[PDB]
Design a protein around this ligand. Sequence first.
Ligand SMILES: *[C@@H]1O[C@H](CO)[C@@H](O[C@@H]2O[C@H](CO)[C@@H](O)[C@H](O)[C@H]2NC(C)=O)[C@H](O)[C@H]1NC(C)=O
Ligand SMILES: *[C@@H]1O[C@H](CO)[C@@H](O[C@@H]2O[C@H](CO)[C@@H](O)[C@H](O)[C@H]2NC(C)=O)[C@H](O)[C@H]1NC(C)=O
Lengths: 240, 224, 210
Amino acid sequence: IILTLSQGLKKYYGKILRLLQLTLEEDTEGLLEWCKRNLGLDCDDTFFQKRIEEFFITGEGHFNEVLQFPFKSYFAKGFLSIDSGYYSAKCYSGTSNSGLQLINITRHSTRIVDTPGPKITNLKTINCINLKASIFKEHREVEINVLLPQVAVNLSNCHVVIKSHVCDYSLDIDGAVRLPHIYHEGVFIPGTYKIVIDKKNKLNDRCTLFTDCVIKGREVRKGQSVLRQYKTEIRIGKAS
Amino acid sequence: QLQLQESGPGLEKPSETLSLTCIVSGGSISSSDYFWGWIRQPPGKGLEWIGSIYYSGSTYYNPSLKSRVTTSVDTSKNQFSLKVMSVTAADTAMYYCARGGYGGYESDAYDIWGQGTMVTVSSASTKGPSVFPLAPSSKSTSGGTAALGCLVKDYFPEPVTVSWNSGALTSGVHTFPAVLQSSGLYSLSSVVTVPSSSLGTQTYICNVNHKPSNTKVDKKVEPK
Amino acid sequence: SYVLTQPPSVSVAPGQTAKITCGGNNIGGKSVHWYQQKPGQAPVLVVYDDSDRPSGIPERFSGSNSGNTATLTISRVEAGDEAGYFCQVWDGSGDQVVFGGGTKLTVLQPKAAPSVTLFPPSSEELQANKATLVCLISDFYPGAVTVAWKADSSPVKAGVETTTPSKQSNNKYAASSYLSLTPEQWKSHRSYSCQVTHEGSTVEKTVAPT
Ligand SMILES: *[C@@H]1O[C@H](CO)[C@@H](O[C@@H]2O[C@H](CO)[C@@H](O)[C@H](O)[C@H]2NC(C)=O)[C@H](O)[C@H]1NC(C)=O
Ligand SMILES: *[C@@H]1O[C@H](CO)[C@@H](O[C@@H]2O[C@H](CO)[C@@H](O)[C@H](O)[C@H]2NC(C)=O)[C@H](O)[C@H]1NC(C)=O
C-alpha cells in the first residue's frame, strides 16, 4: 500500500536503526516505493550506507531529514531524531563534531590476556582502565564512562540510557551494550560512551554490570604496558 | 625473602579428610597482587592444580575436585590451608603450595613454591624404622677410601631423611631411594665414602629422621 | 576443560638446541608459563608470559607463543638441563589453572659402568634374629641393570627385593637390592654374592659370614 510522508519517514529511520545495529528488527514494507515517490531514487542498502557514512563522518555542510547533504528544509548541526516509532535514537552529525570521535574496529586489537581476578568489583573501587564510574548520591544516579568500547559491557536487569558523541538511545535488554556501527572503509564505533543508570527507577533494583576488567600490568614490553583482564561483576542496583 | 612451607600429616586414613597447611614467611599473606594455591603430583604423574585462594577469602577451584576440596586463609597466622574430603589411594601425592599473580598487575605464573609435602593414604599405621650400621671393611671402596652406611629398615610411610655427623659430613654421601617391600614397609640405605686413614680417628654417626612417626635415631658406624 | 598437549619426551645432544611444544586451541591468546622440575624437587618457573625469564634463569632459555602452539627453546643444552618441563596457562573460560602433561628432556650421555658395594648383615641385626644383605649400585648409564644373588655358587630364589633404577642428581642411575636371610642361612653358607650386569659386563661382589 502507499505511505504518506509521516509513515514513510518512520520506516526510513527504521532501516537506518537496523543498519546501525541498534535494532535487530525493522518494518520496511512500502519503503522502496516511498523513496521512489518522495525522493526519486532507489534506496537499496548501498544508498543507506552512504547516508549513514555521510551523516556521521563525511559531512557536506547542511543535512535534511533523510540524511542528504519534500525534505528541502536542510538544517545545520546537532541531531536528527531517528525515530521509527518502534525505537528511536538521538544521533549527531559529524559536522557538529570537532574531530573523529570514532574508532576503527576492523584494525587490529591490542592483545589482552585473561588472568585470575576479583569476581565482584565495587562501584566505588573500579581499578579497570576501561571503566570510570561517577556516583551521584544526590540524584540517586550512576554514570559509567566506558573508555575501551571494544571490551564488552553486559547489562543484567538494567534500564539505562547510552550517551555518546555519535548517538543517544535507551537500552532495556540484557546482554552486551549495543553501539552504533558505521561503515567507512572499515567498521567504526564510538571511541567512548556513557551508561546512565537511574537508581530512582524500580526497574534498576537489581542492575548489574558484567565486563572484563582490563588492567595495566607492571611489565612494559614493546614500549607499552602489557594488558591483562579478568571477568567481574559491578553491582549497581540496591538488591543486586 | 618470601618463603613457603607445607605442613602435613604424612599419612591419612581412607575416607578421612586430609588437611595441609602452608606457612608463609618473610612477608605477609595479605598481598593484594597475589593469591595462594595448592598443586599436587601423584607418583609418576604430572602437576595438577587443586585451587587458589585470595587473602580476602575468595576461592578458585579446579572443577574436577571442587566437590570435595576446600581452602581457607588465616591472615593473622600468615598461612593458608587445604582440605580434601574422603580420600582414597588416588590422593597419595606430593602436595605443593605456591604463590601466583592475581588481579592483573603481576603475571599469573606461580613464581614461589614450597618444598612439597608427601601424603600417603593407607589404612596402615605409621611405623618408625630400625637402623643398623653398615660397617667398613678397612677399604670397602678401592684403597685410599672406604664405604660405610646405615640400613634404615622397615618404616612407613615415606620419607625418611638421613644426615651424617649432624650435617658436618656432606662430601661423598649417597642416600639411595627406598625399596617398597611386599609387606608395604619401606627400606633404604645411606652410604658415605670416607678416607681409609680416618676409620680409627673419626667417629661416623648417621642421623635418621622419620617425621610421620616422630622418630629420630642416631647410629654410630664403627669398623668391626 | 581446556586441554594442553605436550610431547612425552625429547632428546638432545649436549650443545644442541632443544624445543618443547605446548599445543592448545588459540593458545596464543593466553599467557603461557614454563616450569622445570628435576627429580624429587619442586617445580621452578623458568619462562613466564610466553617469553620472559625470572631472575637467575640463563639466557639459553627462551619462549614463544602464537596460533595453537607455544614453544620452549633451550639453546646450547647442558647436562643439568635434563628435567621435566611443564607448560601452564590460566583458562579464562573455565576459570582454572591448566598444566600440560609434561615433557621429559634427556641429554645424551656416555655409557657408564656401575659402582657396586655389598654389605653383610650387621651384628645388631643378627642379634635381632634377622639378616639382610645390601647391594648398592650407582653411577651407571643407561638405567638398566640385571641383579643376581648367589648363595655360594647357587642362585637364590627367595627373599629378594630390588628397586627400579632411578636417576641420581648427576643424571646417572642408582639402584639397590636386598637379600633377606635368617641368621642360620647366613652362617650355613660359605659366602653370598651380588652379581650386577650392565651392557654385557658383569661385576661381582662377595661377602662371607666371617
Ligand atoms: C580501518 O582499519 C583497516 C585495518 O584493519 C584498514 O584497512 C587496511 O588499510 C590499509 C591501508 O589502506 C591496507 O594496506 C590494508 O590492506 C587494509 N586492510 C584491510 C583488512 O582492509 C582501513 O583502511 C581502516 N579504515 C580507516 C582508517 O578509515
Ligand atoms: C558479555 O556478553 C558477550 C556477548 O554476549 C560475551 O561474549 C561471548 O561469550 C561467549 C561465551 O564465552 C562466546 O561463545 C562468544 O563468542 C562471545 N562473543 C563475543 C562477541 O565476544 C562476553 O563473554 C560477556 N562478558 C561477560 C563478562 O560475561
